[PDB]
Amino acid sequence: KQAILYVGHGSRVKKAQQEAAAFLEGCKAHISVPVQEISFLELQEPTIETGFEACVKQGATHIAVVPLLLLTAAHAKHDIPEEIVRVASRYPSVRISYGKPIGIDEEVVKAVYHRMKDIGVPYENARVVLIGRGSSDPDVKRDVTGIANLLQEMVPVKEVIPCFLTACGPNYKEVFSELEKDDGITTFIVPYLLFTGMLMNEIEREVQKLKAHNPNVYLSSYIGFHPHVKNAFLNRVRETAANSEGQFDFDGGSYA
């Protein structure tokens, strides 16, 4: 029988644990699949081993493993697949599919669009600065830039500047330094993050200093588990379960 195994990265923040668990629970009613389990790589239970084993114990013959990830980096390519292989080696008879992070999807740009609209200031011909966490893995910058291009195509903005909190450039603090001008162009700052936290507070403080220089700057709320993010993730789940060409086939001989 078919199963879905949702995999979040997990958190050490009690609230982040609750938000991720509740989001994954609320996903279940949208998927016409009878066996569905949530799990987390780290810091938070159910572990991946527990959720996978629950799928098998409920009689699953096929397990669609879907990572709750905005972008593609070490978690999606390596850490999570290794945990999958570690537990799945013990059940060699179980067929596995493994999904993609949300990535470049029209729905997440729509989530960004609604975060922009929420400020209530005209966005026509406005600049957008899209802040992702960042990674040394080049796929992350590649995907954030792709999302920026999609936002550019879908919303009548002047330009979209992807930038990052860490690991790869440009850092959002350099972009901010180039935006102290005030040329009459409105600038929206959109944090491309699933959760608030240390980095959101840092962004808040840095945007305050920038607003001290340039009053035409507006910080939106972070993307979070926006309904359009939910739509995009549900797309991922459905495509992983269908696996129509076998493009999501996964083994049990360590692929990462």
75 is in an annotated binding site: yes
d(CA 202, CA 208): 10
Q: What is the DSSP letter of 44?
A: S
228 is in an annotated binding site: no
Q: How far, in Å, are 137, 140, 227 from residue 88 at the CA level?
A: 27, 28, 32
Q: What is the DSSP letter of 70?
A: S
| Structure-block tokens of residue 138 | 């080049």
- Counted residue by residue, the chain has a size of 256
**DSSP secondary structure string, 187-221?**
EEEEEE-SS-SHHHHHHHHHHHHHHHH-SSEEEPP
User: Are the C-beta atoms of 203 and 191 separated by less than 8 Å?
Assistant: yes
Q: How far, in Å, are 6, 36, 92, 104 from residue 56 at the CA level?
A: 14, 11, 11, 32
Reduced to 3 states (helix: H, G, I; strand: E, B; else coil), residue 228 is: helix
Per the annotation, binding residues are 9, 75
Per the annotation, binding residues for Fe cation are 9, 75
